[PDB]
Design a protein around this ligand. Sequence first.
Ligand SMILES: CC(C)(COP(=O)(O)OP(=O)(O)OC[C@H]1O[C@@H](n2cnc3c(N)ncnc32)[C@H](O)[C@@H]1OP(=O)(O)O)[C@H](O)C(=O)NCCC(=O)NCCS
Ligand SMILES: CC(C)(COP(=O)(O)OP(=O)(O)OC[C@H]1O[C@@H](n2cnc3c(N)ncnc32)[C@H](O)[C@@H]1OP(=O)(O)O)[C@H](O)C(=O)NCCC(=O)NCCS
Ligand SMILES: CC(C)(COP(=O)(O)OP(=O)(O)OC[C@H]1O[C@@H](n2cnc3c(N)ncnc32)[C@H](O)[C@@H]1OP(=O)(O)O)[C@H](O)C(=O)NCCC(=O)NCCS
Ligand SMILES: CC(C)(COP(=O)(O)OP(=O)(O)OC[C@H]1O[C@@H](n2cnc3c(N)ncnc32)[C@H](O)[C@@H]1OP(=O)(O)O)[C@H](O)C(=O)NCCC(=O)NCCS
Ligand SMILES: N[C@@H](CCC(=O)O)C(=O)O
Ligand SMILES: N[C@@H](CCC(=O)O)C(=O)O
Ligand SMILES: N[C@@H](CCC(=O)O)C(=O)O
Ligand SMILES: N[C@@H](CCC(=O)O)C(=O)O
Lengths: 424, 424, 424, 424
Amino acid sequence: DSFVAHFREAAPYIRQMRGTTLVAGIDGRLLEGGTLNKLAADIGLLSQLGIRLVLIHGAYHFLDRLAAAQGRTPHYCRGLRVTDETSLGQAQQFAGTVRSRFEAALCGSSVPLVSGNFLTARPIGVIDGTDMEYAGVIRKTDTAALRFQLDAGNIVWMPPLGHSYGGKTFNLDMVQAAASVAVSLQAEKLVYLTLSDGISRPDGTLAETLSAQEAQSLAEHAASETRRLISSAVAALEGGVHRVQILNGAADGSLLQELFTRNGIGTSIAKEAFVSIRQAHSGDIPHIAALIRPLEEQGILLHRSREYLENHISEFSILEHDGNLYGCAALKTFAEADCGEIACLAVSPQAQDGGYGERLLAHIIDKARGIGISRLFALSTNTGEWFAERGFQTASEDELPETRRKDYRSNGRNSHILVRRLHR
Amino acid sequence: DSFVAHFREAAPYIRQMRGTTLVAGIDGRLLEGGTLNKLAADIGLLSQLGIRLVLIHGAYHFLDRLAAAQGRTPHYCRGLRVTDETSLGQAQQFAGTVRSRFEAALCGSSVPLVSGNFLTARPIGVIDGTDMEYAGVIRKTDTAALRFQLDAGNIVWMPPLGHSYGGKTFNLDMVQAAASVAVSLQAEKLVYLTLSDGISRPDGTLAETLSAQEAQSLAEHAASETRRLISSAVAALEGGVHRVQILNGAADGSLLQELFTRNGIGTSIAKEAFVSIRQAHSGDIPHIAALIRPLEEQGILLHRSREYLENHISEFSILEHDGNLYGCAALKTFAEADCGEIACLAVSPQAQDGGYGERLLAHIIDKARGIGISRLFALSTNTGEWFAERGFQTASEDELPETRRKDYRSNGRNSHILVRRLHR
Amino acid sequence: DSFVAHFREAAPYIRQMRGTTLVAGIDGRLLEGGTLNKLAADIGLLSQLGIRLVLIHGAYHFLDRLAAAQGRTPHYCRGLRVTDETSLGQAQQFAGTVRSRFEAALCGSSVPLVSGNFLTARPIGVIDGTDMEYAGVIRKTDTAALRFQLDAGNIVWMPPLGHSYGGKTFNLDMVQAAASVAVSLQAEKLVYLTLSDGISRPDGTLAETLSAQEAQSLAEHAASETRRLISSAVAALEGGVHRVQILNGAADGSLLQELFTRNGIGTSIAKEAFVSIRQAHSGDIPHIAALIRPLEEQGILLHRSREYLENHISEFSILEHDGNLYGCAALKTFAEADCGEIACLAVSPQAQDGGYGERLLAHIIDKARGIGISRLFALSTNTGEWFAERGFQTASEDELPETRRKDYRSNGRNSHILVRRLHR
Amino acid sequence: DSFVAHFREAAPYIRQMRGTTLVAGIDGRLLEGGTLNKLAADIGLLSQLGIRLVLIHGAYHFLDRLAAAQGRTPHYCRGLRVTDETSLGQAQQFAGTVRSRFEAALCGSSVPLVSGNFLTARPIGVIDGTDMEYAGVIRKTDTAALRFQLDAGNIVWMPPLGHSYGGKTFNLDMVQAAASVAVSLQAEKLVYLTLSDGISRPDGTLAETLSAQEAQSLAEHAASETRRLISSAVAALEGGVHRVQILNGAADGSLLQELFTRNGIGTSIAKEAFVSIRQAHSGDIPHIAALIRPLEEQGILLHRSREYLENHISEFSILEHDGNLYGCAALKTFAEADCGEIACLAVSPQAQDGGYGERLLAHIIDKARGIGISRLFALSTNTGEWFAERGFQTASEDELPETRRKDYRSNGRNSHILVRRLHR
Ligand SMILES: CC(C)(COP(=O)(O)OP(=O)(O)OC[C@H]1O[C@@H](n2cnc3c(N)ncnc32)[C@H](O)[C@@H]1OP(=O)(O)O)[C@H](O)C(=O)NCCC(=O)NCCS
Ligand SMILES: CC(C)(COP(=O)(O)OP(=O)(O)OC[C@H]1O[C@@H](n2cnc3c(N)ncnc32)[C@H](O)[C@@H]1OP(=O)(O)O)[C@H](O)C(=O)NCCC(=O)NCCS
Ligand SMILES: CC(C)(COP(=O)(O)OP(=O)(O)OC[C@H]1O[C@@H](n2cnc3c(N)ncnc32)[C@H](O)[C@@H]1OP(=O)(O)O)[C@H](O)C(=O)NCCC(=O)NCCS
Ligand SMILES: CC(C)(COP(=O)(O)OP(=O)(O)OC[C@H]1O[C@@H](n2cnc3c(N)ncnc32)[C@H](O)[C@@H]1OP(=O)(O)O)[C@H](O)C(=O)NCCC(=O)NCCS
Ligand SMILES: N[C@@H](CCC(=O)O)C(=O)O
Ligand SMILES: N[C@@H](CCC(=O)O)C(=O)O
Ligand SMILES: N[C@@H](CCC(=O)O)C(=O)O
Ligand SMILES: N[C@@H](CCC(=O)O)C(=O)O
């Protein structure tokens, strides 16, 4: 395609990403070849786009290309490397090699890059009778010092090394470290730059987009490395990171493609928040009435009635949290088998703006599609934009199902009519 | 002595040092033993005293304990190490070992420590037909980024490594690098932490305090290493650093002793600014008269006269810059061979507050001492504090030389009389 | 001792004190002699160490050296001086004498000193049928204006005088005023600079360190002046000040000695927060089990069992607040009468980091010492640092009590073993 | 008049005064009666109007009501009070009485008031054989600390007391002190609040407004007190203060009346900057031509000619600084004896915007009025607003002098015509 077209395509993603925090967990093998040069350039570009950037790299594989290729075997109790004094010292050497390399590649492809004593570590201790030695986990992260650097526009570079109150240095696991730092920062995004195209489905295909539940159910039959990825990704989400992404940092330009295109390569994982929505039953009616009545009083919701609701309760859905009712919505059907109507949509005023409405509309379109409905109408006197911004197109009265058209005419309400087309 | 006494002794030096910038050039051998632990603690303390701190270390000796002890000989065209790709890579490893070590020693003896891509380097090129390879000299220092970190209270850590626009890393000479960074920052103080007690005199004794001229004349007969120290120290001073100090960072606690005691160990070098002061001659008189006359009009300076000055010109000194006269002072003598008087002290109003006065008083006490005078009087109607703050003690009229006592009585001026005791 | 040694001794206290707020309540007799010069110097030094400083002085004794020595007797309903218009006016004169004196002593031993209209006062009214006249108590303190000055580095000087909405000035009690200002600032430290070596015990000895409970029980048999000191000190602590100290500002250098040495002269008072820890009984077991079980599931705590706990309940302690259980710990004993083991230490995750653990360990060492135990072991797979940072030294398996050594061998857990030596 | 009218009258002066610095030198007798209450209220109001306020008071008269009324006579070598240790101590007492009084009066008529160690003093020494003792003059003012307080909105209160490096306090002369502080701040305004209606003319009348030259020539025959006022006022102006005002702080509301009405009570002194304007002669013509020619080329200035100028040189004025010509303007006359025209007005582009034009117009209206002209025309193609904003009203062609009307018609230029009426 054309430059202008590509750039106008990127523009909304640039808008979304600007001023947000991205923690990048970087596989240490990427900092070794000329994939390094490609990466510094793309990270330099991200810097230039107003993205706050914290980069953390791994060391394990480099240590093994020093260990294994020597006559010493690494031990990996839960993927956590046992790391002795000699391995610890190598990691310190590698971390300096790598930060220097990155800095040089960034200077030749002027972007401020900073590193500091941000992590305080503790040893993992003893996993399964096996002393883990210098394998440490982040005990405290200096969030104030980090924010202060990101705020000034600095790129933050972190090795997989933390120090302790006992004046020791510990070896950190990168995959776990990035997710920990990401949660501490409440980073909007965690990115793992791996050697893999992302997480694959049981049928072999690349999982473009996953819920944390979907991710979780895949780990049941997944290799060790990818199980740990998921575990860290899920804990990040649960800890407040908005989105976790898995990419192949060996695929030239994949970071740009992931962040700035609708399509995006790799795997994207996000947490589905908890909103129990269920078929309404008999006992819901007073809760539904109390919610609906103010609105029916205001001329926003059509007048219902204890009897209407009792005899049509099956067409209502209700949204609940801790026994508390907070929303409702009905699916009305017609002689036209293809047609449905979202009716009686309502969120308690105290619970609004937090997405509850959208979840009710979604649940009802799932229900509508479940029964063969490809066309979903909404009629509203005062609330038409909400629908128009969520996939509804203006429609005319002559377009309604015949019986609805008749109610509409005799109403006098002249409500706006919108239709959304539901895919098979 | 007692704690309270020691601490009250330190207090003025703490006051002087607070909020000032100190660049520490650190010999790489100090970061190797438990002298490291001692150093982090003392630097941590300096941090806590509101000193802005930039630390730079060397690598040469570590590289040789890797080179020489391998079967490769280092070459040192002007003390500048030829550094190939393999040596460059080692320096990157060492710099990571050392920054990690320092960070750990600082954490266990919470003080924010930061490092960044502050230096951009260029290669030295070819010294004397000898390709110097990866030996680079600082081309640009990011002074804004540095100030921003020091201002926030961060300790700044720098390796002896700069990068270039060509995406290469270069090996920097520490002694030269610190002096360059120090000038860029206009640091009040540069400290070299060496393995030596400082700079020695021709008679073998430690030069406690040196002018840059004194330092310069010592290099004539000095070993190579100490010649380079001086050269860098002198260029720092000439470049605006206020004071350069040389210490043995192997002498436990020497950094504290140097910064916070009157005595201070090690060598201190400062630049004597240019103030040509000479015996007045015949042709000076109009310049002297024009200066003196306003003051004599105001009742601050005793009335002189073209004839007085013509017949006493030999007792005047004058301070000049670019042919321009800016100050004068006279030495009056008495029948009491031990007694002198500083007379007719005056700095042009446009040239005041810049130390000119003090240099005139000093020059005259040097002249007074040259002729056997151990007691120097100053009489002033309005300017008595200036003398009292520069070593003069209140005296009485009955204490004057006899003939001066007589002039004083018949004057009516009742000027304050102060005496300073001049040492033999 | 040596300078370096003294200064390295001070360094941790300098670190702790930097950027903290200290409110100094100063007896007015200290501002009268050359103890004034000593004090300005030490307060100047504290300024230079990044301590935020609010100074308040008293006036009572000066007023009496004007009253009593005139033919007027002061009346002191609860140590609160009745203060008429004539006494009020003297206090205004004294406050100006004293602020000028202090300012001059500070300038000659450049440190910014500021004072302002920070206190608004109200009269105390009528104590016990006795009109108290111009004796006022702080009604409002301008905390924003105060913070603004401390933040800029200014020393804050306050007289014992507040003004009112009725355009009157009132006489404040210093001891009460400092404690009020200290609470308003949530100052980490309140210091009273008195003419006494601090608070004495019933046996005559100087109470180096007191809890607020200890302070309280001393007042039962204490002189009036010291009763009021305690009362104000205790209310400061209860109001959020971290530590209150009582010193003799007539003992040359005592402020430095108190703030910057382990030993410290004078009396230190701190509030013991509320943590009810008691012998576990039968009914605690479900609460203990629920806490312990997650941890035993994770391989951090040895598997217990409803029966184990039922038959060993006497060796458990539990920490509770509002009936809620938040922590537990057991003392295990051995055939070696000198040996104990802290077992089953656990704080609810929701209640962690707030010191609960430390209080459980302390309680158990108190229990261990109560039965003759001088050696206390801790064995931990993942939690060994916590112990090592709280006085435990690494030990070997051959060092365990014999039966514990046997369990340890057959476990397979390879837990780290640490010992703490308990003093008699 | 009406409130709305008064307030709309004040509005431009409020606009001018907002964010400006005013140093108020306050006679110590004003802080003694209920003139104090009036003053705090008016100063409180000024605070509320965004005026940055530095207040300094005197003490002399209070000291004499303590001296003279005791049996000790004050000595006043140049109006500078000899002040011994006993007088110095009284001044410290008075300064505290007075600051407390002011603070209380300000609180009861919430406005932040701050004072600090801003002045460092030196003794005056010996005037005329007379030791002046504790009479000190400001040696250094802490301008940074002062700006920092004014910037935060604080009112700054200063006593007439400075301290020295020798740990002494000195007695400052208020009149001199305010003018010194005012210059240090480059205050736009210095106000002296005296017991007099301002400076009187030789004919007895109150000098409403004076140049510094006018002020200077009045001192020739003026009382001592008013001579010193002038001397300080003039040195303030010369030192960069924009305006000095003298008022009676005993005239209820005079500070408001001076600052916020066109009329304003009291005396106002301002420095006439140096702009030598003289009759042009023969040798000026090339300088005039070079200036005029660019403009005549642009169609802004009517074409002149070496001959025109040679034969009309007497009607030109020229503005010069250091021999350099920077402006010119001509006065054209007509058969109508009442009519004049400002012709050929021009300032060198490099010297514009600095008031030169206005001074040329003024000089020519002075010349026009000197010969009986009450009507002054300006004709301009592109520059008509400049005139309209400096007192010119639009006029028509039928309104020109007859011969000018004829030139105007045949020109084709259609320049805008404006007239200013010159008062007799
Ligand atoms: C429209 C409604 C159901 C939305 O419920 P919700 O819980 O807020 O749903 P969401 O949080 O997913 O959507 C919230 C967004 O919808 C927008 N919105 C709400 N009412 C709107 C309206 N009347 N017109 C346009 N937009 C509206 C909100 O302003 C909010 O904007 P934001 O994305 O810029 O923050 C609303 O809460 C409601 O119940 N209104 C009265 C009942 C009603 O009108 N029902 C049905 C319409 S026929
Ligand atoms: C006193 C004088 C000679 C100082 O010359 P100088 O070039 O300023 O000398 P320095 O720069 O070394 O000293 C400057 C310091 O002296 C201080 N000083 C100057 N005059 C002073 C005085 N009259 N009283 C007290 N201190 C004074 C300045 O304020 C300045 O203070 P700082 O250290 O706080 O900045 C002054 O310039 C002068 O010539 N005054 C008139 C002549 C006179 O009085 N001569 C002789 C005295 S008998
Ligand atoms: C170790 C434990 C008992 C501490 O309880 P607590 O209520 O937090 O006790 P305190 O608040 O007095 O101590 C808190 C400090 O201990 C530190 N700490 C906690 N776990 C640690 C560990 N595993 N390793 C090192 N330090 C640790 C905390 O990080 C905190 O650090 P800070 O001083 O830097 O803030 C922890 O709460 C716990 O119960 N962990 C699981 C149970 C366990 O391991 N029990 C016994 C060990 S055999
Ligand atoms: C008009 C002129 C003589 C003003 O001289 P000057 O030295 O700037 O005079 P002042 O400094 O007293 O007045 C400066 C103010 O006049 C304003 N001014 C200048 N030219 C102006 C114009 N053409 N229209 C409106 N206002 C103008 C300036 O913008 C400045 O504005 P400020 O008060 O908002 O800063 C101008 O310099 C000049 O010589 N212009 C070309 C010659 C010309 O037009 N001459 C005569 C007019 S027939
Ligand atoms: N959508 C509203 C009715 C609005 C209308 O039909 O005008 C409801 O379901 O009650
Ligand atoms: N020191 C001044 C004279 C002052 C005096 O003697 O009173 C001078 O040398 O002229
Ligand atoms: N301290 C743990 C046991 C850990 C171990 O012995 O390895 C407990 O008391 O249960
Ligand atoms: N005022 C201009 C002439 C402009 C005009 O008359 O149009 C001059 O004096 O030359």
